[PDB]
Curated annotation (Swiss-Prot), chain A:
This is Major capsid protein. Homomultimer. Interacts with FI protein. Assembles to form an icosahedral capsid with a T=7 symmetry. The icosahedral capsid is about 60 nm in diameter and composed of 415 major capsid proteins. The assembly is primed by the interaction between capsid assembly protease and portal dodecamer, and major capsid proteins assemble cooperatively to form the procapsid with the help of capsid scaffolding protein. Major capsid protein forms hexons and pentons of the icosahedron. Viral genomic DNA is packaged into the procapsid through the portal vertex. It comes from Escherichia phage lambda (Bacteriophage lambda). Belongs to the lambda phage major capsid protein family. The gene is E. It is found in: Virion; Host cytoplasm. It comes from the Viruses.
Length: 48, 45
């Protein structure tokens, strides 16, 4: 029952900066593996 | 004694609307008692 008046003027969304350069830049190929575990192997190449 | 008024300058102080001209545009007259300003956090973990 309030008799006052109000007129909205602006509603601004403050958003924190966030930009993914590391994902866009180095990690470029996606391998979705359906199994339980993943294997990674490195072979040394020091021949005496 | 006669005389004549050849020149008469008007003094002025260096005044210029800079902040209002640069940062304040889009005037909004309002026919309302009080105004509302609102903002949304937009902060998610």
């Amino acid at each position: 029952s309030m008799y006052t008046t109000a007129q909205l003027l602006a509603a601004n969304e403050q958003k924190f900066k966030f930009d993914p350069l590391f994902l866009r830049l180095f990690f470029r190929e996606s391998y979705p593996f359906t199994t339980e575990k993943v294997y990674l192997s490195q072979i040394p190449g020091l021949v005496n």
